Design a binder for this molecule. Sequence first.
Ligand SMILES: *P(=O)(O)OCC(C)(C)[C@H](O)C(=O)NCCC(=O)NCCS
Length: 86
Amino acid sequence: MATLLTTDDLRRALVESAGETDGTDLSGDFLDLRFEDIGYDSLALMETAARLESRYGVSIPDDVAGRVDTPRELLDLINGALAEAA
Ligand SMILES: *P(=O)(O)OCC(C)(C)[C@H](O)C(=O)NCCC(=O)NCCS
């Protein structure tokens, strides 16, 4: 069992944690963008991850989510954890 969130899933969720739907375009291959560059707090990354934890069946330790600079890593946390141990 490993329902992997896709680009779109991460996108929608990550916009959702910004509060209002401003619309930081996170479509296509936005995985090379950076959270620091898009003004994201690591606290917010934890918040982002927290949502995905309960949704997909993963658990991301507090400090881990603060160590993700690019969206690819945050996505890879969920995807990877499910593939590793679900
Ligand atoms: P991440 O480690 O890139 O997140 C860094 C953040 C954006 C949280 C950064 O340290 C910040 O916003 N600092 C504000 C100053 C402070 O003391 N914040 C307390 C946060 S609980």
